[PDB]
Amino acid sequence: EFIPSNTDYPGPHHFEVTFQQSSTAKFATWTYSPLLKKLYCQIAKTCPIQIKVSTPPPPGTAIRAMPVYKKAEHVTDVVKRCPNHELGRDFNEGQSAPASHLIRVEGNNLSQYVDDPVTGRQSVVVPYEPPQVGTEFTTILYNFMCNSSCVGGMNRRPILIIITLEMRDGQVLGRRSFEGRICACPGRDRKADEDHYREQ
Amino acid sequence: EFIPSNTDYPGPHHFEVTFQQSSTAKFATWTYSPLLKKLYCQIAKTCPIQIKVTPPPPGTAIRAMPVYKKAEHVTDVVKRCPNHELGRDFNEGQSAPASHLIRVEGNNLSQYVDDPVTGRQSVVVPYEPPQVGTEFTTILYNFMCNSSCVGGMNRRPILIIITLEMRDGQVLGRRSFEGRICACPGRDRKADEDHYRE
DNA sequence: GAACATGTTC
DNA sequence: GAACATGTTC
Ligand SMILES: [Zn+2]
Ligand SMILES: [Zn+2]
């Protein structure tokens, strides 16, 4: 349990996590690499994630975002904000979410922020909301308060976002995961990363 | 007093601040440019600074103190970037306050002073007579934050303000020079000295 | 955004 | 130490 399972498992309900493709326009804040199942996002800059459910789940069902290290070695390490930002004045003050946590859900007040005493694991749970009428997808806002190169945070260590569809009980109804990249230039990094990996 | 004066003023005694030249072998933990009166130093890697003196009324002591080179930022107080101030790697092991950028390695008689009115951080040590056969006294120094350290002096150059002053704390000597805690003190000075030439 | 700065890898 | 990684200046 302390190491959570990256492994995708879309539940009985179709569990789809989709990033509505950013505006094509030049200034991206979060481009997502379909090919790399990787998300390059600017820091503390809201990026939204869509979730598609083929069939409705029993109520109280909810979604848990959780960051973790890709590097097997680090998986053991807990994902947390870099102290330097953890106390940082600039955002702690706007947002009620605990400083430590990396993943902030933006725009929900039922958002529950979690530390697993057993695993000392950061996460943030929100209760599933019916996709807007005439709308396919329940969209969510996620804020990352640490760069991927944030030293004393996950310096230099890639991470995975584990979004799970869970019962109140906690039974896993479906999970999807992808690489994250909080950087300064999610654009450049994506292209270099794409050319860098694809051209290989 | 809030903005300490960069200006050099060797006094009655000849205040000699000098870095005995580094090995000249390829590896450079630290280097000091005499052209730019700038010192390049790897982080937290001990760097030795000596001083050559007229003997000075006892209790005289010497204080290092960092200040931003950029006028705009002289007002700001140089301090360890949180993410280091917290940092386990060295904050444990040494007895000096994490806040502090400059650490003196050799002494236990060193005092790390956080001014209440200015709020500035510096370390004061008492002058020791150069050891016999030694022309001058030599003080270890430790910088616990890269010159490019976020939440500290993340991008902004600094000057080390060294001064020898009496127990009264009056100013007897003073010299300052720019510092740059980097990861590659060598390439930097060559880049910077190279740059300046052209 | 391209030029630059600056830490890290192999 | 060269070549890569990555926030930052203008
Ligand atoms: Zn951070
Ligand atoms: Zn630091």
Q: How many CB atoms lie within 10 A of CB B6?
A: 15
Query: A47 a known binding residue?
Result: no
Which string of DSSP letters, residue by residue, matches B54-89? ----TT-EEEE-EEESSHHHHTSPP---HHHHS-HH
CA dihedral of residues B149, B152, B158, B164 (deg, nearest 10):
-130
Identify the CA nearest to B141 among candidates B23, B19, B55, B16: B19
Q: How far is the CA of A104 from the centre of ligand 1 (A)?
A: 13
Declared resolution, Å: 3.7
Phi, psi (deg, nearest 5) at residue B86 = -65, -35
Report chain A residues whose CB lies below 8 A from the CB of B150: 84, 151
Is the C-beta atom of B191 closer than 7 angstroms to strand D?
no
> Do residue B150 and residue A87 have CB atoms under 8 angstroms apart?
no
Could you give the 3-state DSSP secondary structure of residue A73?
A: helix
- In whole angstroms, give the CA distance from residue B119 to residue B52: 30
Residue B98, C-beta contacts closer than 8 angstroms, at least 6 positions apart: B80, B84, B85, B86, B87, B91, B144
Longest dimension (CA), chain B: 47
How many CB atoms are closer than 10 A to CB A90? 9
CB A14 within 8 A of CB A52: yes
Contact B78, B68 (CB under 8 A): yes
Calpha distance A92→A86 (Å, rounded): 8
Enumerate residues 6+ apart whose C-beta is below 8 A from B96. B103, B104, B110, B112, B123
* Residue in B59, B67, B41 with CA at minimum distance from that of residue B140: B41
Q: What is the largest CA-CA distance in chain A?
A: 46
The gap between B112 CA and D1 C1' (Å) is 38
Q: Using CA atoms, how far apart are residues A191 and A31, in angstroms rounded to an integer?
A: 10
Task: Tell me the CA–centroid distance for residue A178 and ligand 2, in Å.
Answer: 31
How many residues are present in chain A?
Answer: 200
**Is A150 annotated as a binding-site member?**
yes
CB distance A113 to B47 below 8 Å: no
Do residues B161 and B172 lie in contact, with contact meaning Cβ atoms separated by under 8 Å? no
Alpha-helical (H) ranges within chain B are: 71-74, 82-85, 88-91, 185-197
Strands B102-103 and B137-143: antiparallel
- A144-175 burial, b at 16+ Cβ within 10 Å, e below that, comes to bbbbbbbbbbbeebebbbbbbbbeeeeeebbb
CA–CA separation, A163 and A63 (whole Å): 6
Integer Cα distance of B173 and A71 in angstroms: 53
Structural domains in chain B, CATH included, are: 1-198 (2.60.40.720)
- Which residues face A180 on adjacent strands? A39, A159
Q: DSSP per residue over A105-156, as a string?
A: E-S-SS-EEEE-TTT--EEEEEE--PPPTT-S-EEEEEEE-S-TT-BTBSTT
First-residue to last-residue Cα distance in chain A: 35
Which residues lie across from A63 on neighbouring strands?
A: A126, A165
Name residue A91's amino acid: F
Q: Which of A11, A4, A2 is nearest to A175 (CA)?
A: A11
Which residue, chain included where needed, has tokens 């992808």? A178
Element housing B111 (H / E): strand B111-114
Q: Strand (E) positions, chain A?
A: 15-18, 32-33, 38-42, 47-53, 62-69, 103-105, 112-115, 122-127, 138-144, 159-166, 172-183
Q: Which residues of B131-153 are buried (b: 16+ CB within 10 A; e: fewer)?
A: eeeeeebbbebbbbbbbbbbbbb
Which amino acid, residue A131?
A: P
Answer whether B171's CB lies under 8 Å from B165's CB. Answer: yes
Residues 6+ apart with CB under 8 A from B108: B95
The number of residues making up chain B comes to 198
Q: Say how far apart CA B185 and CA B155 lie, in whole Å.
A: 16
Q: Cβ of A151 < 7 Å from strand D?
A: no
